[PDB]
Design an enzyme around this catalytic site. Sequence first.
Site, PDB file in Angstrom:
ATOM      1  N   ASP A 133       0.803  -1.216   0.000  1.00  0.00           N
ATOM      2  CA  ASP A 133       0.000   0.000   0.000  1.00  0.00           C
ATOM      3  C   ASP A 133       0.839   1.271   0.000  1.00  0.00           C
ATOM      4  O   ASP A 133       0.642   2.136  -0.853  1.00  0.00           O
ATOM      5  CB  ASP A 133      -0.937  -0.019   1.205  1.00  0.00           C
ATOM      6  CG  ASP A 133      -1.883  -1.189   1.168  1.00  0.00           C
ATOM      7  OD1 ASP A 133      -2.483  -1.438   0.110  1.00  0.00           O
ATOM      8  OD2 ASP A 133      -2.010  -1.889   2.189  1.00  0.00           O
ATOM      9  N   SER A 137       0.772   6.649   2.040  1.00  0.00           N
ATOM     10  CA  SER A 137      -0.084   5.616   2.602  1.00  0.00           C
ATOM     11  C   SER A 137      -1.465   5.783   1.987  1.00  0.00           C
ATOM     12  O   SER A 137      -2.029   6.881   2.022  1.00  0.00           O
ATOM     13  CB  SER A 137      -0.151   5.716   4.125  1.00  0.00           C
ATOM     14  OG  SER A 137      -0.575   4.497   4.698  1.00  0.00           O
ATOM     15  N   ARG A 138      -2.004   4.708   1.409  1.00  0.00           N
ATOM     16  CA  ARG A 138      -3.219   4.864   0.619  1.00  0.00           C
ATOM     17  C   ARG A 138      -4.460   4.406   1.374  1.00  0.00           C
ATOM     18  O   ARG A 138      -5.543   4.310   0.788  1.00  0.00           O
ATOM     19  CB  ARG A 138      -3.099   4.124  -0.708  1.00  0.00           C
ATOM     20  CG  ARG A 138      -2.543   4.983  -1.823  1.00  0.00           C
ATOM     21  CD  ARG A 138      -1.084   4.695  -2.049  1.00  0.00           C
ATOM     22  NE  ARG A 138      -0.883   3.274  -2.294  1.00  0.00           N
ATOM     23  CZ  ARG A 138      -0.994   2.698  -3.485  1.00  0.00           C
ATOM     24  NH1 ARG A 138      -1.295   3.424  -4.554  1.00  0.00           N
ATOM     25  NH2 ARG A 138      -0.797   1.393  -3.605  1.00  0.00           N
ATOM     26  N   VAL A 139      -4.336   4.125   2.670  1.00  0.00           N
ATOM     27  CA  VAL A 139      -5.536   4.139   3.498  1.00  0.00           C
ATOM     28  C   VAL A 139      -5.840   5.566   3.923  1.00  0.00           C
ATOM     29  O   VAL A 139      -6.961   5.885   4.329  1.00  0.00           O
ATOM     30  CB  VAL A 139      -5.401   3.189   4.703  1.00  0.00           C
ATOM     31  CG1 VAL A 139      -4.921   1.828   4.250  1.00  0.00           C
ATOM     32  CG2 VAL A 139      -4.490   3.767   5.761  1.00  0.00           C
ATOM     33  N   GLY A 140      -4.853   6.447   3.812  1.00  0.00           N
ATOM     34  CA  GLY A 140      -5.037   7.862   4.035  1.00  0.00           C
ATOM     35  C   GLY A 140      -5.236   8.214   5.492  1.00  0.00           C
ATOM     36  O   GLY A 140      -4.669   7.610   6.405  1.00  0.00           O
TER      37      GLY A 140
END
Lengths: 504, 52, 187, 465, 469
Positions: free
Chosen positions: A341, A366-369
């Site tokens: 991710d 980070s792509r869960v943000g």
Amino acid sequence: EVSSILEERILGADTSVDLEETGRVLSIGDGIARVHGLRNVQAEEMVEFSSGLKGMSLNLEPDNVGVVVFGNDKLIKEGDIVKRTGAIVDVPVGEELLGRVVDALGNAIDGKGPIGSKTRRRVGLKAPGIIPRISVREPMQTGIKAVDSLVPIGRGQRELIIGDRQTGKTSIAIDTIINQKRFNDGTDEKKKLYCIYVAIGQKRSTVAQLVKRLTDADAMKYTIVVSATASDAAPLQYLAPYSGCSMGEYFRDNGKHALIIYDDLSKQAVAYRQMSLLLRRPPGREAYPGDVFYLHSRLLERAAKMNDAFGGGSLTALPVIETQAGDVSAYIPTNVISITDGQIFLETELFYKGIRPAINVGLSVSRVGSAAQTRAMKQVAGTMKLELAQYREVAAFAQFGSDLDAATQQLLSRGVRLTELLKQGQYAPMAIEEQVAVIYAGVRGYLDKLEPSKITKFENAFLSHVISQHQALLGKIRADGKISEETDAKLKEIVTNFLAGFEA
Amino acid sequence: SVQNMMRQKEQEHMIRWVEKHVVQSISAQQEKETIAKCIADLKLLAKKAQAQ
Amino acid sequence: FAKLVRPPVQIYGIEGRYATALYSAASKQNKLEQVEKELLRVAQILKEPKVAASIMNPYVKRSVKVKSLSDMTAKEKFSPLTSNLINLLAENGRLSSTPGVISAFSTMMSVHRGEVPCSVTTASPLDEATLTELKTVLKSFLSKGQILKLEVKVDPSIMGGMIVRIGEKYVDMSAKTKIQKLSRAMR
Amino acid sequence: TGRIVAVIGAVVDVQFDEGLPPILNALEVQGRETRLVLEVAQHLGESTVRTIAMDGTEGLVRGQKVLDSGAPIKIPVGPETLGRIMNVIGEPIDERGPIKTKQFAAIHAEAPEFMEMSVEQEILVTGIKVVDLLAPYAKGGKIGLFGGAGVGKTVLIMELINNVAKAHGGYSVFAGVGERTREGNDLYHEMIESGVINLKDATSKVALVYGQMNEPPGARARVALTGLTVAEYFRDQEGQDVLLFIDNIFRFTQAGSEVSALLGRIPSAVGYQPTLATDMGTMQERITTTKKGSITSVQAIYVPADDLTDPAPATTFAHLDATTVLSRAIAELGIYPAVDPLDSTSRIMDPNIVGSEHYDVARGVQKILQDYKSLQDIIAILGMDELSEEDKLTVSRARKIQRFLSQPFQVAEVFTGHLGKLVPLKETIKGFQQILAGEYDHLPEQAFYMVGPIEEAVAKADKLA
Amino acid sequence: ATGRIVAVIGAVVDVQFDEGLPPILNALEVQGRETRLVLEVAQHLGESTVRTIAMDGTEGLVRGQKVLDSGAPIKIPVGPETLGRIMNVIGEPIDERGPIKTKQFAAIHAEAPEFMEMSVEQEILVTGIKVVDLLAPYAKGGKIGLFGGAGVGKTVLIMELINNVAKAHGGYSVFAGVGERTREGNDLYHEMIESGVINLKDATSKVALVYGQMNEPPGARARVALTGLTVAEYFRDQEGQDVLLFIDNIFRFTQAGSEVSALLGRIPSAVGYQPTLATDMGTMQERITTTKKGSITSVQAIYVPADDLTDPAPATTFAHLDATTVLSRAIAELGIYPAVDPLDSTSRIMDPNIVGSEHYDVARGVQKILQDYKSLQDIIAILGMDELSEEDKLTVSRARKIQRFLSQPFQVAEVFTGHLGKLVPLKETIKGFQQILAGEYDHLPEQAFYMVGPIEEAVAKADKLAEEH
Ligand SMILES: Nc1ncnc2c1ncn2[C@@H]1O[C@H](COP(=O)(O)OP(=O)(O)OP(=O)(O)O)[C@@H](O)[C@H]1O
Ligand SMILES: Nc1ncnc2c1ncn2[C@@H]1O[C@H](COP(=O)(O)OP(=O)(O)O)[C@@H](O)[C@H]1O
Ligand SMILES: [Mg+2]
Ligand SMILES: [Mg+2]
């Protein structure tokens, strides 16, 4: 009573006879045995030789079978007897492993005693599908002021720690084990975390120094360490990543939470390339086989956030990857980047310029943000991320700048002082309620008159104050989760009272 | 740390004597070999009835 | 192409490709026993110093090594399909591997009545009552109506026990029950 | 039937007796729990075929039994496949019961012939003002979608599904080629909460094909073929105007060069397969406009190591007809959708394809948007008032144009509260033909932010003050 | 059990047995030669046919020479009597002073100690070199590495630590020389008689020597390093003394196995090494450890091929080293000697709980002003030196005095220099560098610190330059 326990074991031993499906050895060399016979072996099935070593049959060919050896081949002569066990490889798993040192096959190497685990589990299982998963929302607390502010980690996310040699990649993943002590001795059952650490091809003296570091901080009563070292055979450094997820999936299957650290995955692709080219498989780019993407994908996809109908468990995975001269465009640094991710990119230039931990926040994502941050941390760090990003645009004017606009002089003035809040000593992980207070002191504007060298001394003074004299405010951000309007005024006179009489 | 450490010193020295002393005791028991064949096949008579 | 009958052993190699292609032509026309009696005498008439020479000698030719063999297999006893086999081995240069094809064919024809014999390797040979008892319990294990053959070997390194193999089964009652005393150590 | 002789990795060899199956068939292993489909790829002689597996290979014994279907991999196809999720072999993977339909189709199918192609270019209208004016979409062509996460890409996917089913009446297929399980779960639940898929009735508008990332390298390469069979049903049998989404096209190329190296072949240039130009040929030539209907494809493109001349993003570039790029620097400016107007190109942008009315309007927009890009540097370094009075209008007009490209979507009605507008083609050309001439220049800037046509712009200047 | 030779290609000899097959890693004696030729078994090939590697040359071998077997691997002689002697790979003495007469024979192939036989304690071993003790301190019982290219000083810096450390040390010492020039094994035998470390008249010597040089066949440059750490395992295990171990070079253990590889039947990996590269390296480097029966300090020189630390042979030894001392040609071409890179050398004990908080904030204070000096050179290339401000005209002049103060005149490099040998203690190295950083020597030119010892000689050398104007 030393004679009694030895007499006890040998009457409790099982000496029974069975059948077998044996087959003689054709040609042993460099760790690849060729066995003639064994007409009913499955693929990837564990056999065992006449001396005592074990073997995993990878190539099912017409006239022979290629079986790697779990040891050294000086005990294997041509003309031996290769018996069959009849089962794929399985590891012991359970609660009893907590606080032990194990190799890649579940044996005990620390010499305390044998494992009393009653269950057993395969290493070749599959990931859960699309339906038993749910989106990641709970925070996984690391304890580093730069990770939880700008590149957060949720409970089910895969986050890659990528960087060169000797830049604190092992140290970032060794205080994340220490920081979860504050939840692991309390009462809240849905906030505990369990850590597993896999060492793949390191020397034995380094692992013996790291267990003592985790014994000192009283953090080896909820941690397991799986050690496949450098001296051990080439396939034991291949099973050892898959022998740790099978111990981190017993906590996901039973409603608990977990954490796993692969240190490191760039020494598993090398221990697997040697096994391929000795079994005569067609090579590819940099002599890796055609399925090295399929080797790392089905290990990281086992990290999942389960939903409430299956238990609500989780599994969080942090792999370490060593680049060479900062080139992430190699073969293995591009496989594991496209699977996971986000990355944490530790440079070597910032390590000697004073920035320690040397996290580059220009290239880390980070792509869960922001959906894995608490409400308190999200409110202050949303402006800090925008404030630091405006500083990195104008970092090239600092070396010769005095004839600039007062906004640009202000943008330099806040960027230097926000940087000093991000530096942190080793083995000192903080709390989220103490982290949000230090960021709140900086992002509001309460530091633009303090000298840039004093920002470290001011911070260690201010933190020891609010632990003893304002303990009832750091229980109304820990339990509340958010920062209200009542706590916004109550924190406001605190950093104004301390800043007034400070220099003494 | 002295009572439990030194117990492991004679735990290993116990088995260090026996496994070198078994092979010098069973080497002359050829009179036990004539029953060792006669007890093996009755287990095989018990064993070949399992698949049949 | 046409289909071919499968042998019950199915060995591999450059010698198994010639013991299978003969088994797929002699199981047809019901001549599997006529070739076997011929092949156990062509092994004798090759290993003579007049004939063992100038078949491995590479400096003769291909064609005159055929004509010195096309009349040798024609005059004595043979005119079956097997005369084409010696004619085909000499064309492909595979005349050196002719003991490999013959020795493969005997075990491929053995399994039509054979039993993949045993191996009892314990000690000095014992009395007759112990031998007839194992020969009459192993007959109960085959369950195939075939008179089992057996070999006995002497190996004194096993202390007091014996290992027995039935084909590919390999029961074990030997000195490895002394190596199972690691439960006193590994526990 | 057949028997398995050799098992080496994800490559199984099968020995037959009489019925030797041809290449591109599909076998099925007997004795296992889940379906394990093998695909024949080479005839090795002496009745032996070379098969690539499609699931896990362990547990396979030498000498098992293997049947034969006599045909390639056949999937459940129909109109009742809308709203379901399937893998590469047609099985459902969302635990909502077996899909029931009338007919099946094979995935390995030839291209249309030469006498069936369309003989003329034709523009596909999707409603968005920035797409259908500056980088228009040809019917049947291939589209490349530049941009990744954090830019607002998965909304633009969910909105082009909705508008074609309104203005044209054609459904869509989504094919996830080697996609993450965590990100292939959020797109399931983001479509549920926007209406384009529906768990209660038969008003769904998509069919999902998900070949996920942890599958063997033979099973990640055929997903873009399984997700093209379904898209060929709604053209050959009903005559709709279908869309097709592949995400992404680099994981179709890269999954090809791992089957061609497990099969023992010498690699080409930098590491790819020898057959890099026919596997891109024998897939993307089935995406065309026949005489019945059409199939249009929007594909995501990832460029490795920022090399535009690497052979994986160079084979693909010869097939595309239009590229749209999602810039993150327009997303921090407030504009949605975040489509860059200057760095998007179209091949059908031509006075002999779309006519002279579309041409000279959309030509002047990209010229005026360059002059504001060149004058924004003198203002930032030197200052404002030194430039001429003829240039102050070009600064003012170009901030009207780049906010008139914004448009509220129908998929976001719940969150941002506005009304979703679908603009036809003749309004978007009429609108920008008047902004250039200074006809609506005296109105302020925020009358143009987030409106539909030019009619709703002057109805928003009245509400200010 | 006799056996015949059926094939000879290069250094790889094939031997077919008939009745008794010897296991892998044994010794086979070729009957028929006037010299002793030993073959080491490496693979099995079926039908009683092994494939061996030869320890000596293979000229004059004929197909059919009867070959004996030993029943054991290469057992060299070992004990106290081997001190002060040069010996071969198989244990023959090549000092021409007679037979080595001892009682213990030991194979060179043995296992690694387990996880509960490791030691955990750390110390600091003081040397006297200013760059080493300040920024990357060495340790007792710890593995030390000396990196760098060709011709920068790896053999001289490893000759310096025999000069300082080995005579003040109590226990014994072992020098294994693997694949280097045969000249330089004679400038060690003649620089250790005149210093009395090797004694040719009685039994008071303290150094053993094991030599396999670069004229040997490539099957003999890959079993000498296993013969060095077999003698050095006797002193640690069967006795209890503190042992040292010097190895130069160790890149010639990896390279000499990348030559016999393709004839043994192996596909090559990346840039040309064997597929089993990181396994037999990690099988030797797990015997050089500190256990609970002794302690082995070990210094190793590691050749880096053509100045590239991303080559697969030097970039996998990093996992086995505690203190790395990366040498560099970009420093050595300035005249700064020893050319040690300060921004590339590490240690595991640079730790303010081990070296104290005063040494720690001095080490990082030096690296911070050197790294900030690097980013300033990019400005001077376009602007110039004089157009800078007065505040960063001072951090350059403080950095240039720190570069020059690290260079120290060595003792064994007298014949290069003519200067004298200095040995600065540990308490003086810190106090020398506090005062250049704080600004107590801003009134001296840069040349007053070049090739000096302690800081006392930096001002005595300053006045002597002044009077000649
Ligand atoms: N926050 C910190 N501040 C100062 N020093 C640190 C910090 N973290 C780590 N170090 C130091 O950096 C050195 C090396 O760090 P570490 O071993 O974690 O890096 P690594 O790259 O993981 O190592 P390897 O290259 O062996 O994997 C250690 O000696 C440690 O003392
Ligand atoms: N004390 C020293 N400082 C700097 N350079 C040295 C020193 N001693 C030797 N050198 C230089 O190092 C070069 C190589 O020396 P040596 O260490 O023997 O070779 P290598 O390091 O390549 O084995 C010589 O040319 C010499 O000029
Ligand atoms: Mg590390
Ligand atoms: Mg040298």
